[PDB]
């Protein structure tokens, strides 16, 4: 998840916390480094 | 955390590569110079308010110097 | 006992009492001979007499 976040969005992920929902789907909280703005890459995708 | 005894150490440690900050705490009886480096937090207790100010200038302008104060709910 | 043991230690260390009479009292203090601290002292002061 650290590597594929470097490929797709070209932002380094300093910390990842995986989880598995009761649904079977595996969530992840990716913390992208303070040199990068996660509110920037969000609007690069979505979001609101 | 580690203690600094001589002042010839507090010059060496501040001039190490890793030390990213020097936190300066003012107490009634003394002032602490808390050097934040990678593994340990090195501190220096002066105890004489005259000698303290003079040290606070000799610190190289390279390293950040934070004045340690009470922080409220900025968040 | 803890009261009677400590009064004999305090005398032998202050040399009010011999090591020989200490051992004569120490063993009796265990024999329920001395009814209390004041009873021990009266018996010492009676030995010095």
């Amino acid at each position: 998840i650290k590597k594929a976040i470097r490929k797709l969005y070209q932002v380094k992920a300093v910390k990842v916390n995986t989880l598995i929902r009761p649904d079977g789907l595996k969530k992840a909280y990716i913390r992208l480094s303070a040199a990068h703005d996660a509110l920037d890459t969000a609007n690069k995708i979505g979001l609101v | 955390p580690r203690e600094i005894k001589t002042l010839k150490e507090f010059l060496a440690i501040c001039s190490r590569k890793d030390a990213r900050c020097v936190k300066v705490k003012h107490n009634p009886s003394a002032t602490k110079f808390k050097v934040r480096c990678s593994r340990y937090l090195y501190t220096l207790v002066v105890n004489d308010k005259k000698k303290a100010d003079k040290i606070e200038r000799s610190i190289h302008p390279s390293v950040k110097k934070i004045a340690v104060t009470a922080r409220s709910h900025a968040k | 006992l803890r009261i009677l043991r400590r009064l004999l230690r305090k005398y032998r260390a202050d040399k009010k009492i011999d090591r020989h009479v200490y051992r004569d009292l120490y063993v009796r203090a265990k024999g329920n001979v001395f009814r209390n601290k004041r009873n021990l002292v009266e018996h010492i002061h009676k030995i010095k007499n």
Binding site: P22, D23, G24 | - | -
Partner: protein
């Protein structure tokens, strides 16, 4: 309990998805039979032992 194999966790993950009600539109298919979901479930009765 807190413990679970992951293989067992998923079987309850699937069974939680299957409890949803029958979509409203799917009643409107031409020649339709299904009305309410007959396989629905409640933990209070008929316990999966997974």
């Amino acid at each position: 309990g807190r413990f679970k194999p992951l293989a067992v966790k998923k079987k309850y993950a699937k069974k939680m998805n299957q409890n949803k009600p029958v979509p409203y539109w799917i009643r409107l298919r031409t020649g339709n039979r299904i009305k309410w979901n007959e396989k629905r479930r409640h933990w209070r009765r008929t316990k999966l032992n997974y």
